Write a protein that binds this ligand. Structure first.
Ligand SMILES: CO[C@@H]1O[C@@H](C)[C@@H](O)[C@@H](O)[C@@H]1O
Ligand SMILES: CO[C@@H]1O[C@@H](C)[C@@H](O)[C@@H](O)[C@@H]1O
Ligand SMILES: CO[C@@H]1O[C@@H](C)[C@@H](O)[C@@H](O)[C@@H]1O
Ligand SMILES: CO[C@@H]1O[C@@H](C)[C@@H](O)[C@@H](O)[C@@H]1O
Ligand SMILES: CO[C@@H]1O[C@@H](C)[C@@H](O)[C@@H](O)[C@@H]1O
Ligand SMILES: CO[C@@H]1O[C@@H](C)[C@@H](O)[C@@H](O)[C@@H]1O
Length: 266
Protein backbone atom coordinates (compact mmCIF):
# COMPACT_ATOMS: atom_id res chain seq x y z
CA UNK A 1 0.00 0.00 0.00
CA UNK A 2 1.26 3.55 -0.54
CA UNK A 3 0.92 4.20 3.20
CA UNK A 4 0.00 2.87 6.58
CA UNK A 5 -3.52 3.78 7.78
CA UNK A 6 -4.10 5.35 11.20
CA UNK A 7 -6.84 6.17 13.67
CA UNK A 8 -6.50 8.41 16.72
CA UNK A 9 -8.38 9.23 19.93
CA UNK A 10 -7.64 11.35 22.97
CA UNK A 11 -9.09 12.10 26.41
CA UNK A 12 -8.78 14.49 29.30
CA UNK A 13 -6.67 17.61 29.36
CA UNK A 14 -3.21 16.11 29.79
CA UNK A 15 -4.14 14.69 27.30
CA UNK A 16 -3.78 10.99 26.79
CA UNK A 17 -3.63 10.05 23.08
CA UNK A 18 -3.76 6.65 21.38
CA UNK A 19 -2.82 6.22 17.73
CA UNK A 20 -3.56 2.92 16.01
CA UNK A 21 -1.66 2.02 12.83
CA UNK A 22 -2.61 -0.70 10.34
CA UNK A 23 0.48 -1.88 8.52
CA UNK A 24 0.53 -4.96 6.33
CA UNK A 25 -2.30 -6.64 8.09
CA UNK A 26 -1.37 -5.85 11.69
CA UNK A 27 -2.65 -3.06 13.88
CA UNK A 28 -0.44 -1.73 16.67
CA UNK A 29 -0.74 1.18 19.09
CA UNK A 30 1.38 4.16 20.16
CA UNK A 31 0.46 5.96 23.38
CA UNK A 32 0.94 9.36 24.96
CA UNK A 33 0.15 9.99 28.60
CA UNK A 34 2.08 13.30 28.95
CA UNK A 35 5.63 11.97 29.23
CA UNK A 36 6.74 10.51 25.84
CA UNK A 37 5.34 8.17 23.28
CA UNK A 38 5.41 4.44 23.95
CA UNK A 39 4.14 1.20 22.44
CA UNK A 40 0.82 0.03 23.80
CA UNK A 41 -0.65 -3.34 24.54
CA UNK A 42 -2.94 -3.38 21.48
CA UNK A 43 -1.98 -5.88 18.82
CA UNK A 44 -4.60 -7.33 16.49
CA UNK A 45 -4.98 -8.27 12.85
CA UNK A 46 -6.43 -5.75 10.47
CA UNK A 47 -5.90 -3.87 7.23
CA UNK A 48 -8.15 -0.98 8.30
CA UNK A 49 -8.79 0.62 11.66
CA UNK A 50 -11.09 3.14 13.30
CA UNK A 51 -11.45 4.10 16.96
CA UNK A 52 -13.69 5.93 19.43
CA UNK A 53 -13.43 6.42 23.16
CA UNK A 54 -15.28 7.93 26.11
CA UNK A 55 -14.71 8.55 29.82
CA UNK A 56 -16.88 7.42 32.70
CA UNK A 57 -15.51 9.47 35.56
CA UNK A 58 -11.72 9.01 35.30
CA UNK A 59 -11.98 5.65 33.52
CA UNK A 60 -11.31 5.49 29.79
CA UNK A 61 -13.21 3.12 27.53
CA UNK A 62 -11.86 2.56 24.04
CA UNK A 63 -13.39 0.71 21.04
CA UNK A 64 -11.16 -0.20 18.10
CA UNK A 65 -12.78 -1.53 14.88
CA UNK A 66 -10.33 -3.76 13.08
CA UNK A 67 -11.22 -4.86 9.57
CA UNK A 68 -9.84 -7.65 7.45
CA UNK A 69 -12.29 -8.10 4.37
CA UNK A 70 -15.96 -7.58 5.37
CA UNK A 71 -15.12 -8.93 8.83
CA UNK A 72 -14.72 -6.25 11.29
CA UNK A 73 -13.92 -7.14 14.90
CA UNK A 74 -14.42 -4.72 17.81
CA UNK A 75 -11.73 -4.69 20.46
CA UNK A 76 -12.57 -3.14 23.84
CA UNK A 77 -10.49 -1.53 26.51
CA UNK A 78 -12.37 -1.01 29.78
CA UNK A 79 -9.48 -0.69 32.20
CA UNK A 80 -7.97 -4.16 32.07
CA UNK A 81 -6.90 -5.70 28.84
CA UNK A 82 -8.25 -5.73 25.34
CA UNK A 83 -11.34 -7.88 25.00
CA UNK A 84 -13.48 -9.00 22.09
CA UNK A 85 -16.62 -6.91 21.71
CA UNK A 86 -20.10 -7.74 20.51
CA UNK A 87 -20.00 -5.72 17.28
CA UNK A 88 -20.99 -7.53 14.13
CA UNK A 89 -21.58 -6.32 10.55
CA UNK A 90 -14.51 -2.74 4.80
CA UNK A 91 -13.30 0.81 5.68
CA UNK A 92 -14.90 2.14 8.87
CA UNK A 93 -15.35 5.26 10.93
CA UNK A 94 -16.71 5.44 14.50
CA UNK A 95 -18.12 8.00 16.89
CA UNK A 96 -19.65 7.84 20.37
CA UNK A 97 -21.45 10.09 22.83
CA UNK A 98 -22.65 10.18 26.39
CA UNK A 99 -21.82 7.63 29.05
CA UNK A 100 -24.13 4.73 28.10
CA UNK A 101 -22.55 5.17 25.52
CA UNK A 102 -24.14 5.45 22.16
CA UNK A 103 -21.84 4.35 19.31
CA UNK A 104 -22.23 4.68 15.55
CA UNK A 105 -19.99 2.75 13.21
CA UNK A 106 -20.07 3.61 9.47
CA UNK A 107 -18.74 1.08 6.96
CA UNK A 108 -17.90 1.83 3.34
CA UNK A 109 -18.09 -1.36 1.34
CA UNK A 110 -18.42 -1.78 -2.49
CA UNK A 111 -19.37 1.92 -2.89
CA UNK A 112 -22.02 2.06 -0.18
CA UNK A 113 -21.92 3.35 3.36
CA UNK A 114 -24.08 1.74 5.96
CA UNK A 115 -24.44 2.27 9.74
CA UNK A 116 -24.44 0.09 12.83
CA UNK A 117 -25.68 1.45 16.12
CA UNK A 118 -25.28 0.74 19.81
CA UNK A 119 -27.52 2.51 22.36
CA UNK A 120 -26.75 0.22 25.32
CA UNK A 121 -28.85 -2.81 24.44
CA UNK A 122 -27.38 -4.47 21.34
CA UNK A 123 -26.22 -3.59 17.83
CA UNK A 124 -28.77 -2.64 15.19
CA UNK A 125 -28.69 -1.29 11.65
CA UNK A 126 -29.27 2.43 11.48
CA UNK A 127 -31.17 4.55 9.01
CA UNK A 128 -28.06 5.92 7.29
CA UNK A 129 -27.49 4.64 3.75
CA UNK A 130 -25.49 6.77 1.34
CA UNK A 131 -22.99 6.20 -1.45
CA UNK A 132 -19.33 6.31 -0.64
CA UNK A 133 -15.99 4.63 -1.03
CA UNK A 134 -14.52 6.33 2.06
CA UNK A 135 -16.07 7.58 5.24
CA UNK A 136 -15.20 9.74 8.21
CA UNK A 137 -17.38 11.01 11.05
CA UNK A 138 -17.54 13.43 13.92
CA UNK A 139 -20.30 14.20 16.42
CA UNK A 140 -21.09 16.51 19.30
CA UNK A 141 -23.72 17.00 21.95
CA UNK A 142 -25.65 20.21 22.52
CA UNK A 143 -27.25 19.59 25.88
CA UNK A 144 -29.11 16.34 25.32
CA UNK A 145 -29.19 16.51 21.53
CA UNK A 146 -26.67 14.61 19.33
CA UNK A 147 -25.37 16.05 16.12
CA UNK A 148 -23.51 13.79 13.65
CA UNK A 149 -21.59 14.72 10.56
CA UNK A 150 -20.61 11.97 8.12
CA UNK A 151 -18.19 12.79 5.32
CA UNK A 152 -18.82 10.41 2.42
CA UNK A 153 -16.40 10.45 -0.49
CA UNK A 154 -17.07 9.05 -3.92
CA UNK A 155 -15.93 9.88 -7.46
CA UNK A 156 -16.38 14.68 -4.18
CA UNK A 157 -17.03 14.57 -0.49
CA UNK A 158 -20.64 14.94 0.60
CA UNK A 159 -21.45 15.84 4.19
CA UNK A 160 -24.49 14.17 5.72
CA UNK A 161 -26.02 15.72 8.83
CA UNK A 162 -28.05 14.23 11.67
CA UNK A 163 -29.58 16.83 13.93
CA UNK A 164 -32.44 14.85 15.63
CA UNK A 165 -34.73 13.28 13.12
CA UNK A 166 -33.27 12.51 9.70
CA UNK A 167 -30.14 12.84 7.59
CA UNK A 168 -29.75 16.01 5.50
CA UNK A 169 -27.16 17.12 2.97
CA UNK A 170 -24.79 19.62 4.50
CA UNK A 171 -23.13 22.74 3.12
CA UNK A 172 -19.62 21.18 3.06
CA UNK A 173 -17.69 21.61 -0.12
CA UNK A 174 -14.04 20.95 -1.03
CA UNK A 175 -11.72 20.27 -3.97
CA UNK A 176 -11.19 16.47 -4.03
CA UNK A 177 -9.75 13.71 -6.15
CA UNK A 178 -11.00 10.16 -6.67
CA UNK A 179 -9.77 7.92 -3.88
CA UNK A 180 -9.60 10.74 -1.37
CA UNK A 181 -9.53 9.84 2.32
CA UNK A 182 -10.83 12.13 5.04
CA UNK A 183 -10.72 12.63 8.80
CA UNK A 184 -12.84 14.94 10.91
CA UNK A 185 -12.92 16.51 14.37
CA UNK A 186 -15.22 18.97 16.14
CA UNK A 187 -15.36 20.97 19.32
CA UNK A 188 -17.61 23.25 21.34
CA UNK A 189 -21.25 24.04 20.86
CA UNK A 190 -21.22 26.06 17.67
CA UNK A 191 -19.54 23.73 16.70
CA UNK A 192 -16.18 24.18 15.07
CA UNK A 193 -15.38 21.38 12.62
CA UNK A 194 -12.13 20.60 10.81
CA UNK A 195 -12.12 18.11 7.92
CA UNK A 196 -8.75 16.93 6.56
CA UNK A 197 -8.57 15.37 3.10
CA UNK A 198 -5.69 13.40 1.65
CA UNK A 199 -5.75 13.86 -2.13
CA UNK A 200 -2.89 12.40 -4.15
CA UNK A 201 -0.25 12.82 -1.52
CA UNK A 202 -1.33 16.19 -0.12
CA UNK A 203 -3.52 16.79 2.93
CA UNK A 204 -5.57 19.98 3.08
CA UNK A 205 -8.09 21.29 5.61
CA UNK A 206 -11.61 22.73 5.42
CA UNK A 207 -13.00 24.60 8.41
CA UNK A 208 -16.41 25.50 9.82
CA UNK A 209 -16.84 27.91 12.72
CA UNK A 210 -20.58 28.53 12.36
CA UNK A 211 -20.89 30.56 9.15
CA UNK A 212 -19.50 28.83 6.06
CA UNK A 213 -16.63 26.54 5.15
CA UNK A 214 -13.18 27.99 4.51
CA UNK A 215 -9.79 26.60 3.59
CA UNK A 216 -7.60 26.25 6.59
CA UNK A 217 -3.90 26.83 7.12
CA UNK A 218 -2.97 23.13 7.33
CA UNK A 219 -1.09 21.90 4.32
CA UNK A 220 1.18 18.84 4.64
CA UNK A 221 2.12 15.81 2.64
CA UNK A 222 0.28 12.56 3.20
CA UNK A 223 -1.66 9.74 1.59
CA UNK A 224 -3.60 8.99 4.78
CA UNK A 225 -4.83 11.13 7.63
CA UNK A 226 -6.33 10.79 11.12
CA UNK A 227 -7.07 13.49 13.64
CA UNK A 228 -7.99 14.06 17.26
CA UNK A 229 -8.59 17.21 19.32
CA UNK A 230 -9.20 18.32 22.87
CA UNK A 231 -10.01 21.53 24.80
CA UNK A 232 -8.17 22.99 27.70
CA UNK A 233 -10.79 25.49 28.79
CA UNK A 234 -11.57 27.50 25.67
CA UNK A 235 -8.26 26.62 23.87
CA UNK A 236 -8.39 23.91 21.19
CA UNK A 237 -5.51 21.55 20.59
CA UNK A 238 -5.47 19.42 17.42
CA UNK A 239 -3.21 16.57 16.36
CA UNK A 240 -3.15 15.41 12.77
CA UNK A 241 -1.36 12.15 11.90
CA UNK A 242 -0.18 12.29 8.29
CA UNK A 243 1.17 9.15 6.69
CA UNK A 244 3.14 8.55 3.50
CA UNK A 245 4.70 5.04 3.20
CA UNK A 246 5.48 3.80 6.70
CA UNK A 247 6.24 7.33 7.78
CA UNK A 248 3.69 8.97 10.02
CA UNK A 249 4.27 12.60 11.05
CA UNK A 250 2.26 14.30 13.77
CA UNK A 251 1.27 17.91 13.20
CA UNK A 252 0.15 20.03 16.09
CA UNK A 253 -2.14 23.00 16.52
CA UNK A 254 -1.94 24.64 19.94
CA UNK A 255 -3.31 28.05 19.03
CA UNK A 256 -0.27 29.47 17.21
CA UNK A 257 0.29 27.70 13.87
CA UNK A 258 1.00 24.11 12.83
CA UNK A 259 4.14 22.56 14.33
CA UNK A 260 5.84 19.20 14.23
CA UNK A 261 5.05 16.82 17.05
CA UNK A 262 7.12 14.33 18.96
CA UNK A 263 5.24 11.32 17.61
CA UNK A 264 7.38 8.53 16.25
CA UNK A 265 6.42 4.96 15.20
CA UNK A 266 9.49 3.52 16.96
C1 LIG B 1 -2.05 1.23 30.32
O1 LIG B 1 -2.16 0.62 29.04
C2 LIG B 1 -2.10 1.52 27.93
O2 LIG B 1 -3.20 2.40 27.98
C3 LIG B 1 -4.47 1.75 27.78
C4 LIG B 1 -5.58 2.79 27.91
C5 LIG B 1 -4.48 1.05 26.42
O3 LIG B 1 -4.32 2.04 25.39
C6 LIG B 1 -3.34 0.05 26.40
O4 LIG B 1 -3.25 -0.68 25.18
C7 LIG B 1 -1.97 0.72 26.66
O5 LIG B 1 -0.95 -0.22 26.74
C1 LIG C 1 -20.99 -3.73 26.99
O1 LIG C 1 -20.73 -4.10 25.63
C2 LIG C 1 -19.49 -3.65 25.10
O2 LIG C 1 -19.42 -2.24 25.14
C3 LIG C 1 -20.40 -1.61 24.29
C4 LIG C 1 -20.28 -0.13 24.53
C5 LIG C 1 -20.22 -2.06 22.85
O3 LIG C 1 -18.90 -1.60 22.42
C6 LIG C 1 -20.31 -3.60 22.76
O4 LIG C 1 -20.14 -4.08 21.44
C7 LIG C 1 -19.23 -4.20 23.70
O5 LIG C 1 -19.36 -5.63 23.68
C1 LIG D 1 -32.50 7.08 16.06
O1 LIG D 1 -31.87 6.75 14.83
C2 LIG D 1 -30.57 6.16 14.93
O2 LIG D 1 -29.71 7.03 15.65
C3 LIG D 1 -29.48 8.29 14.99
C4 LIG D 1 -28.58 9.12 15.91
C5 LIG D 1 -28.84 7.97 13.62
O3 LIG D 1 -27.58 7.31 13.86
C6 LIG D 1 -29.82 7.14 12.77
O4 LIG D 1 -29.28 6.86 11.47
C7 LIG D 1 -30.07 5.83 13.53
O5 LIG D 1 -31.01 4.99 12.88
C1 LIG E 1 -25.75 24.60 10.10
O1 LIG E 1 -25.04 23.98 8.98
C2 LIG E 1 -24.91 22.56 9.04
O2 LIG E 1 -24.26 22.18 10.26
C3 LIG E 1 -22.94 22.72 10.31
C4 LIG E 1 -22.37 22.31 11.67
C5 LIG E 1 -22.12 22.22 9.11
O3 LIG E 1 -22.02 20.79 9.24
C6 LIG E 1 -22.79 22.63 7.80
O4 LIG E 1 -22.08 22.19 6.66
C7 LIG E 1 -24.22 22.06 7.76
O5 LIG E 1 -24.90 22.47 6.59
C1 LIG F 1 -8.01 30.01 12.57
O1 LIG F 1 -7.27 29.01 11.86
C2 LIG F 1 -8.09 27.89 11.57
O2 LIG F 1 -8.48 27.17 12.77
C3 LIG F 1 -7.35 26.54 13.43
C4 LIG F 1 -7.96 25.91 14.67
C5 LIG F 1 -6.65 25.57 12.50
O3 LIG F 1 -7.63 24.59 12.10
C6 LIG F 1 -6.13 26.33 11.28
O4 LIG F 1 -5.48 25.50 10.31
C7 LIG F 1 -7.33 27.01 10.57
O5 LIG F 1 -6.95 27.78 9.42
C1 LIG G 1 3.79 18.54 24.19
O1 LIG G 1 3.95 17.55 23.20
C2 LIG G 1 3.09 17.75 22.08
O2 LIG G 1 1.75 17.50 22.43
C3 LIG G 1 1.50 16.18 22.93
C4 LIG G 1 0.06 16.12 23.39
C5 LIG G 1 1.85 15.16 21.87
O3 LIG G 1 0.96 15.36 20.75
C6 LIG G 1 3.30 15.31 21.47
O4 LIG G 1 3.69 14.37 20.44
C7 LIG G 1 3.54 16.73 21.01
O5 LIG G 1 4.91 16.94 20.67
Amino acid sequence: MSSVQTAATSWGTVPSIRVYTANNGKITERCWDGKGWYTGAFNEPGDNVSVTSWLVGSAIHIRVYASTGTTTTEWCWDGNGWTKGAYTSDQTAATSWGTVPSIRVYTANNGKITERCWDGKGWYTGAFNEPGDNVSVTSWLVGSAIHIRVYASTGTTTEWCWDGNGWTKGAYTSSTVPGDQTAATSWGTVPSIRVYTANNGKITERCWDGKGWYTGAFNEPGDNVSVTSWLVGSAIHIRVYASTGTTTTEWCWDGNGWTKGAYTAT
